[PDB]
Amino acid sequence: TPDRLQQASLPLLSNTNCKKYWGTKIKDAMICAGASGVSSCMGDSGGPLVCKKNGAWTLVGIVSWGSSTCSTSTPGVYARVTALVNWVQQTLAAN
């Protein structure tokens, strides 16, 4: 592993196209990104996939799972935050 924090830019994929790689493993609460010459990898899990919207960085994905060899030609799979944000808000409001 690296001592220093790394970054990479990468494109979002559609779930329909991501299914060409991963088949029925892709569910509606997942979003794929990458296959572009970079990959998230072991130890990145839980961290952010952020996209800029109206000038602010917004959490779109949570690093989840992908290739056991971190192949840069296969998309990574991230938890899809839009599918999960209502639960986040309910949890914060109640605690």
Partner: protein
Amino acid sequence: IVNGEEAVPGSWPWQVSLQDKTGFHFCGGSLINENWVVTAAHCGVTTSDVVVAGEFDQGSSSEKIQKLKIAKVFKNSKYNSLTINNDITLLKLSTAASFSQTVSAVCLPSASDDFAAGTTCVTTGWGLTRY
């Protein structure tokens, strides 16, 4: 991250490291406010783990980092460990993070926000750079 590059120090101020009691980094997370961190459910965080905020170089002794204790782990009730679906956990911190130039929150989307295929986004972390 394989084939990424080094970040500018402090430029991703919501990024945290989750470390076990031995000091081993095992997962990332993101600050969403001073009291709460979002991470993956499959990271298996417990209240014995530590949230480290404000870090750039895990090999440095000179950074002004914040080591924050975890009060409670909220695993999403829809998380399915068999399929790794709904892979999200919230961590409520025992001690609030102190926001600064190098420590601050990421925004959350609305449930109805659209992020189109082909949009270029960014990911960050201290994961492996080579398998």
